[PDB]
Every structure is written in structure tokens, then in C-alpha cells.
Design a protein around this nucleic acid. Structure first.
Ligand code: ZN
Lengths: 191, 197, 254, 129, 52, 158, 129
RNA sequence: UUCAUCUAGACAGCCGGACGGUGGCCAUGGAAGUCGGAAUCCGCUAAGGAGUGUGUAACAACUCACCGGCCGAAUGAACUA
């Protein structure tokens, strides 16, 4: 196939500045600065008017050109990730035993505690990656708040508590207990 | 395919050259039976036909040579609009369309329009459905073999969508926080259009 | 087996004058048979059911109103038996669910409304008023395993000794829409938003509050909270039972 | 508890475990001797569901005598009548055949030639000459 | 017990899945083809049996 | 005063069992036998054929009223002997009832119909009759619609 | 003996009449349960004022062992049976063919009766003439 | 390779309708769109099958074809090696 030229557009709102080296993408905004390494992707970035960035791959195949739109999603998520943020609301699911959550410290790592899951006596301590915030927010019963700038960082940790709390050698169709993703949106409301 | 749309083009032409005046009916949230009852009432008086916005928009372009008046109403043709041709008094047609309403039931998922109330009322309902009442966490009491609400409670707030269980409870008491009916946005009359209001 | 057991209880004038029964004297003699509740022993109970007029239907709060609970309860109502309802295993509900103030109140409402449906569905038209009411004092809360429980009518009296509060209508005031309205001292009938900070019920404010506070002392083994509140709680201890730890200190105190 | 029609003491109970514990008394508490348990066999009944397509023949040991018979499916209503006393063995001919010929459609002549009832003289099995 | 909305939320991840005839993995979004190479990305899918 | 409203599939002219009423009408404090008696009275001449039974309770009075059903009423007219459940399974129906008979029922149906013209109501009501599959005036019921469309069965829309 | 074996021999088994006081949700198992144990629904009913059914059914005694527990297991303990023998039903399947549906219980009957392996056919007991 | 859909708005996407006659004929205890045999009709039609699934014992309550709102240029299906 080998399209000579294929590109996608990356809108730059007013509050975002992007510093782009060969493959070192740096997005700078109101809430902070995000950085990612893309030396694996072999793309070409071009600044048009400081408000639109065109990324194009020349003589790229279906495998090659598809990842270009992946980059645009990656950069767009950075842009909204430093401006609107990414917030994850986590809901406790329990039939009889309420899952007991705490925040604990071990060597200064901000460990999240899971106790009494299914009545189990073990302690689940899951380190919190930098930039992700834990909040227990009222007005919805048994829900914690997972917030942070980069979508990859928040969802990887938001998921990881879900997997440690899976039921073994039991019908998961009846044992619905767990800690499950409820909402995936932006920290800024309606934005 | 092409023939029917040209047939629709022809059908619009016929009504375009049979009824000097028309209504621009707002079809937002219109159910199917409610349409049936409307077309039952308008019999003899009016005709109802809506269709593809683009077809309606495109058809007149081939009709604009004979019908250049419809230019003025196009920037009012946005969204869910239909065509009701009639030659009947302004006031009468508007009211009857907007008067006949249906106490539309709440289906799970539909956004709660405003704060729904439950009042200390005698249900007059067979006790077996108490489980349904319990499911929503409504304090209840059995007198005369029916449920009776103890205290008034704001069940859900304005906004937040009605869940499946809430929909079940509202359907039982015939409570329905939805009023659904045909609307009308604009009015075309002898080549002079103005909002319905 | 269903064998009657002899139980003898004296009582003073204030609680025997408050007795709406065709009877005379100051002594009451209770003869109780402990039939097993297994549904496949449904014949040892049907003979056992007939011999009495009142039946203690024990119901567990965690499992709720179970299938066999309904069946024998219908069986008792077939004979026109007046029931008294007792819910055990509050300790289970207060240590497994840890339902703090309203869920415990709401769960009780779930069951008692549930059982009230049953008695209203199976009341024969010769008595009619066989309905059970915690307001009418036929519903208790306590731990059978640990051996402690309470009655609202027993609890209703404890307050005028310190507040001078009325008794006649506060026994039915503890349920339904009626709120103590703390910071205002008025038994209101609605939250009304309290002009902000919506106000609480008398049930949650008065009876459960000491119970849950003692657990915090006891179920976490908090030695610093036991002596102060117990003296406020006008109870006495023994020379050596004070030196018992949690899950066993709780037993003796209540 | 009672005995089946085939001579086996068939104990009855409410449920599966109820038999276990109640019987558990027998070897240990109630009787105190070990015994065995088996499922009770259902007593079946034998009949025909056709009309004896071919005529039956049998020879005596001396071969001097021969018997020619027919087999037919007596319907349930006659069986119901027999077991419920509507057709009484102790009654006499020219009266016993009247009701079942009248109220069950049988032929006047054949119903008169009833030799015996079987088994035991009051069973539901019949011989017609 | 779990409130019905939360039960649906959890079941969307626990029950609302498919199974490959050949590899048995629980990974549709709504897929028509398996993602595993052991099954060779085969298209033979069933909906995972819903309890009762 | 509550006007309670129910339907049935009780067969005409054959007493409708309370066993399909006691579950429904029994809860609402009604003597089944007398309210059931009303059902049989409302269904007398409809013998043989199931039809739905409108029932209006004005404070515990069973005013049952057979809804006149296109399928049911035609089959009564065919003169076929009333079908007993025992008699035969899925008996077919072939009465030669005239088209002119249908328009009388169409005037019984337009109130419950939607056709612009009374002929269009005949399209509908015969469409229900078309489901039944019975023969009408030695011709396909479907062609009557086409024949009507061909301006052959001219209906007196009055 | 010969004449019986020429007229399409059959075996007839006793049928219980079983009536169930079950609530609404659990009656569905009965229709599922009965057709797995050949049970036959007779009539459904509900008591006035209560929602529980009262449903009458025919179950052959054959498929009547442990029946209540699976009924108890299928209904979550909510259904409650009352059990009584009603009448006899005829086996549609041939009880002479050893590999037939009725030919296993009779073979088992041969096992419990000590009889031979082959069942007497009409060829024996009959002198062909 | 073939056959298609497509600014007279292709496909995906978010939302609405998805009727009435009608519990279509009949059966099974009961069957109402959905255990089944049967007809694949008609009106309003923007369009709706006497029904593609969740569904109850039946109900019922959901839901999809079917068609319409919002966006805009290509897209679908079956076959080849
Ligand atoms: Zn696979």
C-alpha cells in the first residue's frame, strides 16, 4: 500500500506548550509537565502554527501508519491529561463482609491497605505511583478517588487493586465481591 | 431506492401544492401510539408527514423555482422537525397538539428530570408487592391489607438517572416522572413564518 | 425434643400495674418447650405448637426472614398463636457488617416490616390484632450466645429517671418519622434539614450510641475507655472478672 | 412404618436425613442391633394392551383336552368398578351383569357367562365363557 | 448483598464475556475473533454461560 | 369507586372457570361463583368460540361484556359445530361468510380502527381474518384488499 | 400363560397424586422436574389471599425416590409436598424386549426374583396346533 | 474477483421511536411475539417482523430487527492466493 504521506492533527489549546525532541515528548500546562519517550515509534513531528502539530509517516504500512494515530491519541491524552486531568472513582463491592480499606506507610511509600476482603485476614499493600492521589470522598458510600495527570499511570494502578482482589476456585458469577472501576473521566467537571 | 425518494419528492410536492399553510411540528420525545392518536384527531383537518431532514432540504431545492418562499424558514429547520399541513385556526391546532399528553412511565436509564417525591399515601396495593417496595428501601406499614408509606422521602435528586429498581417502584404506583407529547416549534402561513410559542 | 421448662420471675408494682391482661397476682410462671427448628422435624413441632398460645419465633438478623422461618410462623398462625419476635445475633451484625447507626436501624425495619406483612397476611378474623410491633414491645434485640438483650419498654423507663420524660407515647415514638432533634430538645417528626446539618432520630441518638461506643472500647481492646463510661453506666464489676479481654469482656458487661 | 404387599417392612419418613438419624437410633439407640437398608421395590401389575391377535392353544398332559381362549384389555372403569365394589363377586348372575352391561357397554349375553373373579375371588382379572 | 446497579457493574466484567472454543480465554469486548495465538485468533466464540 | 378492568380467553357459551378468575378476581374480595355467573351470562350466544371479555367493576359488580372480536365473531357465523377441546386439535375453519357481512363488523371496528376510509378498516379487519386463514366468498382474502385497491369492493363510508 | 403373552403384554405401574403448596417463583422447577422424572401436571391453583400455588400432579412410583429433596433443592426449601398414590398407568414401552425401556426393570425384577435371563415368550406355553 | 451501500449523508458512533388490529389460528394447565404446529395480512405510516434476543409456569417487565435525530466521506458483504 505504502501511502506516500499520512498525518493526523494534534490541537494545541491555549494552556499547553509541547517541547518535542527527536522522540522525547514534553507537555507543559497549568497542573504540571508530562514527559514520555517514543524512540520506538519512528514518526515525524512538525509544528504548523504553534497551535497545530502535524505528525506524518512517509511510506508507512498498515502496521506502521496505524501507530501514528496511536501517537496522536497519546499526545492528546497528555494535553487533556495536564489540563483536565484523569480521575478514577473506585467502588467497593461486597455481599456480607465489607472490605476494610486504610492508607498506611511502609518506608515512605504510601501503601493502600485492603483488609478483611472476603473475611481474609491478610493485608494487601499496593504502592501508589507518583502523581496518583487517593481520596475517600463522601456522598457516595464506599468509594475512593484515584486522580492523576497521565492516563497510563492512573489506570494501571487503578486496575492493580482490582486484580489482587479476585476470587479463587469459586464461581465469580455468584461471588461479585471486589473493587471495580466505576467511572473513567476527567478531573475537571464538564471539561 | 432512488425512486422512493423521488416518490417522496413527489409526495412533498403534492402537499406543497395542496395546503397553503402548515405547522412545523416538534417531534422531540414523541412515542408511536401518541402519533397514532394525533393522526386520528387531525383527520380531515390536517396531514402529517415527516422524513429525512436532508431529503426535505434537498427536495425544496428542486422545488425552489416554483416555491422560493420556503427560503425564510430553513434556518428554523434544525433538529427534530416535521411537517403538518393544515388550513385551520392558529390557536385551536396548537393547543390540542400540546394538550393531549401521556403520563409516560419511567424506564430504567432515563435521566431524572427533577426531584421525585414519595408521600405518606395509602397504596391500596396487594401486600405481595411489599418486596418490591422494600427493594427501594421505603419504610412501609401494612394496614387494611395494603402498604402505607410512613414518611416523605426525596428518593433521588434532580439529575441522577433513575435506576432499574426505582423504575420498578414508580411503575407499580403508576408514578411516572415523564410527560411526553408532540411539540411545535415554528409556523409557516401563506409564505410568512414565525415561531409557534 | 419439646420439653417444658419451669421459669419463675418476681416483679414490682410499677411493671405489674402496667399489664393489660386478665390475670391476678404478682408471680408469673413460664413453661417453655425447645422444639428444634429443622424443617424435616416438622412433626415434632406441630405437636409442640398446639400445646401453647404464645410462640417465640427467633429470627436471625444476618440471614433475615428465611424460608423455614416463614413456614413454621405460618404454622403457628394456623393455630391462632400470638407470637413474640426476638432477633438474635446483633453482635454478628455489629461485628461482621459494622453497620453503624442507621443501617442497623433500617435492617431492623426491613425485618419487622417483613414479619408485619406475614401477620397481617395470616391473621385469622377472630383476633385481628395479632400483629407484631416493636413499638408495642413484642420485639427485642440482643445476643443469645453472649446472653444479653434489651426491651424498649424496659428501656423506656430508664430515661425519666434522669430526664423526667413521658412514657405513654414515647414507646411508639421510637419508630417511624420522629426525630430527637438534638441541640434543640424537641421530639420533631421530620428532619426539615435543621437549617443545615440535618438532625437525628431518638432511636439512633439514645439507645445505640452507648452500645457502639462500648464496642470501640471492647472490640479493639481499648483499656482506656472501659472504666469511665461504666461508672456513667451505673453497672458494677467483680473482683476478678474485670481482667478479661475482648470478645469475652463484652460478654460479661452486657 | 408398615409392611409392603411383598413382605418387606417399608419404613416411611419426612426426608432423607430424617431416615438417617431415626434409623441411626435403631442400630445404636432405639433398637441397638445392626441391620441393612435397601430401596423398596415398586409392585407392578401385568396386563395386555391389545386384543389377542392370535388365538391361544394349550394341551393337557394327557392331550385329550384342549382349551381355546382369548385375551382382552378390560378397561380401567371396569377395574375401577371392581376394586370399588360396583361389581360385587357376592352378587348373583342376571343382576351383576346388568349394571356393567348398562353402564359400561358390555354385551348382555357374554356378561352373563362369568365363571369367577381373580385372584382371591374379588380381584380385577376376569374369565368369560 | 450488592445493590442491583453495582451488581450489573461487576457482572459486566465478571459475566458479560465470551469464550473461544479452542483456547477458552475470557476476552471479548464484544469480539468476533479470539486474541490468542494459541487459538490462532479463531472466530469461534460463545457467550459465557450466565448463572442459572 | 374503582372501575376494575380485565380480559379473558374464556370460550363463549361455556361457563368460564373461576380457576382463571380466583387468581385474579379472588384477591379483590369477590364471590367467584356470582361474578363468574356474570361471565357466563355475558358469553351466552358466543358459544363455541373463545373471545376476550371486558369486565367493568363499579364497586363490586361484575359487569362483564364480550369485546366483539373480528376473529371470534366471524367464526361464530361460519356455522361450524362448536369446537370442544376433546373433539379435535386445530380444527380448520372454512365458513363462506360474505364480504358484506364483514363491513357490518367493520362498522363495529372503525371505532377501534385507524383507516382513513372505511374500506381501509376492511383491509385491517380482514387482515385479522387473514391471520385466521378462513375462506371468504370463494376467494383469497388478500385479493379483497387488492380488489378494494382496484376499486371493486366499493365500501359505503357512512 | 400362553394367551397373556400373545395379546401384546404390558406392565402397569402405580401413580401417585401429588399436590404442592409452593410459592410463585419455585413452581417453575416442578414443570422442569416432572418431565425429568416423567411427572404429569394435572391442575394448578392458588389459595385466596395467599400467593402460594396448590398444584396437583401424577408421578409414577418408579421416579419417586428422593423426589422431595430435589424438589426442596430446586425450590430453595419453599415448596412443600403432600404425597399420595392415585392410580395405575400403563407402560407405553414394551416390557418383553430386554433392551426396551420397560425391559430393564423387569430384568431387574428377574434379578430380584431369581428367574431366568430370558423372559418367557409366547412360543413357550403354547402347543402349536 | 464479484456483488453491493453512498452529500438525495455510505459504515461506526451517542439518542428517540420500534405502534395498533393483536391475548393473529390452535394447542398444552396455562402461551399474551418468542415450548410448538400455522399465516407471513392490514391501518396510521418517518418504520416496525404477527417478531432477533433477556425474560415468567403464564403473564408481565425489558430488547432487537425496522426506521428516524447529531457528525461528515467513503464503507459494507461474499469469494480468490
Ligand atoms: Zn480463541
Amino acid at each position: 500500500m505504502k501511502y506516500i504521506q499520512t498525518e493526523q492533527q494534534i490541537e494545541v489549546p491555549e494552556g499547553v506548550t509541547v517541547s518535542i525532541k527527536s522522540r522525547i515528548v514534553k507537555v507543559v500546562g497549568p497542573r504540571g509537565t508530562l514527559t514520555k519517550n517514543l524512540k520506538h515509534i519512528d514518526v515525524t513531528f512538525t509544528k504548523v502554527n504553534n497551535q497545530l502539530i502535524k505528525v506524518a509517516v512517509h511510506n508507512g504500512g498498515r502496521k506502521h501508519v496505524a501507530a501514528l494515530r496511536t501517537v496522536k491519541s497519546l499526545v492528546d491524552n497528555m494535553i487533556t491529561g495536564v489540563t483536565k486531568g484523569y480521575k478514577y472513582k473506585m467502588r467497593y463491592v461486597y455481599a456480607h463482609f465489607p472490605i476494610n480499606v486504610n492508607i498506611v506507610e511502609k518506608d515512605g511509600a504510601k501503601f493502600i491497605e485492603v483488609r478483611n476482603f472476603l473475611g481474609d485476614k491478610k493485608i494487601r499493600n499496593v504502592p501508589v505511583r507518583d502523581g496518583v492521589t487517593i481520596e475517600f470522598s463522601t456522598n457516595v458510600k464506599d468509594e475512593i478517588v484515584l486522580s492523576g495527570n497521565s492516563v497510563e499511570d492512573v489506570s494501571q494502578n487503578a486496575a492493580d487493586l482490582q486484580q489482587i482482589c479476585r476470587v479463587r476456585n469459586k464461581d465469580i458469577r455468584k461471588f461479585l465481591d471486589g473493587i471495580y472501576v466505576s467511572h473513567k473521566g476527567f478531573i475537571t467537571e464538564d471539561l | 431506492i432512488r425512486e422512493k425518494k423521488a416518490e417522496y419528492f413527489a409526495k412533498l410536492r403534492e402537499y406543497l401544492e395542496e395546503y397553503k399553510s402548515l405547522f412545523v411540528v416538534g417531534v422531540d420525545n414523541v412515542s408511536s401510539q401518541q402519533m397514532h392518536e394525533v393522526r386520528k384527531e387531525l383527520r380531515g383537518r390536517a396531514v402529517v408527514l415527516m422524513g429525512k431532514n436532508t431529503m426535505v432540504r434537498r427536495a425544496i431545492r428542486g422545488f425552489l423555482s416554483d416555491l422560493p418562499d420556503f427560503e425564510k424558514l430553513l434556518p428554523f429547520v434544525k433538529g427534530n422537525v416535521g411537517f403538518v399541513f393544515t388550513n385551520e385556526p392558529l390557536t385551536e391546532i396548537k393547543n390540542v397538539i400540546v394538550s393531549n399528553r401521556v403520563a409516560a412511565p419511567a424506564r430504567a436509564g432515563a435521566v431524572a428530570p427533577e426531584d421525585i417525591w414519595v408521600r405518606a399515601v395509602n397504596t391500596g396495593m396487594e401486600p405481595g408487592k411489599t418486596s418490591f417496595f422494600q427493594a427501594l428501601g421505603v419504610p412501609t406499614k401494612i394496614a387494611r391489607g395494603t402498604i402505607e408509606i410512613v414518611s416523605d422521602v426525596k428518593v433521588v435528586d434532580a439529575g441522577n438517572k433513575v435506576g432499574q429498581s426505582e423504575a420498578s417502584l414508580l411503575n407499580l404506583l403508576n408514578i411516572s416522572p415523564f410527560t411526553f407529547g408532540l411539540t411545535v416549534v415554528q409556523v409557516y402561513d401563506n409564505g410568512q413564518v414565525f415561531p409557534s410559542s | 425434643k419439646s420439653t417444658a421448662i419451669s421459669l419463675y420471675s418476681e416483679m414490682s408494682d410499677e411493671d405489674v400495674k402496667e399489664i393489660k391482661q386478665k390475670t391476678d397476682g404478682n408471680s408469673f410462671l413460664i413453661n417453655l418447650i425447645d422444639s428444634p427448628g429443622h424443617v424435616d422435624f416438622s412433626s415434632e413441632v406441630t405437636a409442640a405448637l398446639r400445646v401453647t398460645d404464645g410462640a417465640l419465633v427467633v429470627v436471625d438478623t444476618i440471614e433475615g426472614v428465611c424460608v423455614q422461618t416463614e413456614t413454621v410462623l405460618r404454622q403457628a398462625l394456623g393455630e391462632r398463636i400470638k407470637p413474640v419476635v426476638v432477633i438474635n445475633k446483633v453482635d454478628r451484625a455489629l461485628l461482621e457488617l459494622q453497620v453503624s447507626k442507621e443501617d442497623l436501624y433500617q435492617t431492623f425495619a426491613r425485618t419487622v416490616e417483613s414479619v408485619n406483612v406475614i401477620v397481617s397476611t395470616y391473621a385469622d378474623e377472630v383476633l385481628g390484632d395479632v400483629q407484631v410491633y416493636p413499638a408495642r414491645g413484642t420485639v427485642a434485640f440482643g445476643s443469645g450466645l453472649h446472653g444479653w438483650a434489651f426491651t424498649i419498654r424496659q428501656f423506656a423507663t430508664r430515661y425519666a429517671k434522669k430526664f423526667g420524660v413521658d412514657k405513654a407515647k414515647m414507646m411508639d415514638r421510637l419508630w417511624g418519622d420522629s426525630f430527637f432533634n438534638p441541640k434543640t430538645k424537641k421530639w420533631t417528626n421530620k428532619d426539615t434539614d435543621a437549617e443545615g446539618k440535618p438532625l437525628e432520630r431518638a432511636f439512633n441518638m439514645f439507645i445505640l450510641d452507648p452500645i457502639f461506643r462500648l464496642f470501640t472500647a471492647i472490640m479493639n481492646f481499648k483499656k482506656d475507655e472501659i472504666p469511665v463510661l461504666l461508672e456513667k453506666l451505673e453497672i458494677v464489676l467483680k473482683g476478678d472478672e474485670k481482667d478479661l479481654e475482648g470478645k469475652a469482656l463484652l460478654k460479661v458487661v452486657m | 412404618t408398615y409392611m409392603s404387599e411383598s413382605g418387606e417392612h417399608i419404613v416411611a419418613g419426612t426426608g432423607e436425613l430424617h431416615l438417617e438419624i431415626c434409623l441411626q437410633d435403631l442400630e445404636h439407640d432405639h433398637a441397638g442391633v445392626p441391620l441393612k437398608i435397601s430401596p423398596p421395590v415398586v409392585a407392578y401389575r401385568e396386563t395386555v394392551e391389545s386384543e389377542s391377535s392370535q388365538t391361544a392353544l394349550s394341551k393337557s398332559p394327557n392331550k385329550h383336552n384342549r382349551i381355546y381362549l382369548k385375551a382382552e384389555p378390560i378397561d380401567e372403569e371396569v377395574s375401577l368398578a371392581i376394586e370399588n365394589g360396583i361389581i360385587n363377586p357376592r352378587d348373583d348372575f342376571k343382576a351383576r351383569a346388568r349394571i356393567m352391561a348398562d353402564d359400561y357397554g358390555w354385551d348382555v349375553t357374554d356378561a352373563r357367562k362369568i365363571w369367577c373373579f381373580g385372584p382371591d375371588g374379588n380381584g380385577p382379572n376376569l374369565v368369560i365363557d | 448483598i450488592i445493590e442491583p446497579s453495582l451488581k450489573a457493574l461487576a457482572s459486566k466484567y465478571n459475566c458479560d464475556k465470551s469464550v473461544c472454543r479452542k483456547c477458552y480465554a475470557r476476552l471479548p469486548p464484544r469480539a468476533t475473533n479470539c486474541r490468542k495465538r494459541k487459538c490462532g485468533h479463531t472466530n469461534q466464540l460463545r457467550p459465557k454461560k450466565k448463572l442459572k | 369507586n374503582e372501575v376494575k378492568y380485565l380480559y379473558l380467553r374464556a370460550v363463549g357459551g361455556e361457563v368460564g372457570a373461576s380457576a382463571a378468575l380466583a387468581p385474579k378476581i379472588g384477591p379483590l374480595g369477590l364471590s367467584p361463583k356470582k361474578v363468574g355467573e356474570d361471565i357466563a351470562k355475558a358469553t351466552k350466544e358466543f358459544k363455541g368460540i373463545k373471545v376476550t371479555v371486558q369486565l367493568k367493576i363499579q364497586n363490586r359488580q361484575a359487569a362483564a361484556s364480550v369485546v366483539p372480536s373480528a376473529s371470534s365473531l366471524v367464526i361464530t357465523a361460519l356455522k361450524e359445530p362448536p369446537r370442544d377441546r376433546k373433539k379435535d386439535k386445530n380444527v380448520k375453519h372454512s365458513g363462506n361468510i360474505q364480504l358484506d357481512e364483514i363491513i357490518e363488523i367493520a362498522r363495529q371496528m372503525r371505532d377501534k380502527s385507524f383507516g382513513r376510509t372505511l374500506a381501509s378498516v376492511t383491509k385491517e379487519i380482514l387482515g385479522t381474518a387473514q391471520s385466521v386463514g378462513c375462506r371468504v366468498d370463494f376467494k383469497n382474502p388478500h385479493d379483497i384488499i387488492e380488489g378494494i385497491n382496484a376499486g371493486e369492493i366499493e365500501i359505503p363510508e357512512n | 400363560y400362553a394367551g397373556f403373552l400373545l395379546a401384546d403384554p404390558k406392565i402397569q405401574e402405580p401413580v401417585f397424586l401429588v399436590e404442592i403448596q409452593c410459592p410463585e417463583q419455585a413452581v417453575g422447577g416442578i414443570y422442569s422436574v416432572l418431565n425429568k422424572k416423567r411427572g404429569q401436571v394435572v391442575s394448578e391453583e392458588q389459595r385466596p389471599g395467599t400467593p402460594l400455588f396448590t398444584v396437583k400432579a401424577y408421578l409414577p412410583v418408579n421416579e419417586s425416590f428422593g423426589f422431595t429433596g430435589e424438589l426442596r433443592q430446586a425450590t430453595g426449601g419453599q415448596a412443600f409436598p403432600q404425597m399420595v398414590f392415585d392410580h395405575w398407568s400403563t407402560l407405553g414401552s414394551d416390557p418383553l424386549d430386554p433392551t426396551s425401556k420397560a425391559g430393564e426393570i423387569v430384568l431387574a425384577a428377574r434379578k430380584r426374583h431369581g428367574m431366568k435371563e430370558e423372559v418367557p415368550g409366547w412360543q413357550e406355553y403354547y402347543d402349536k396346533l
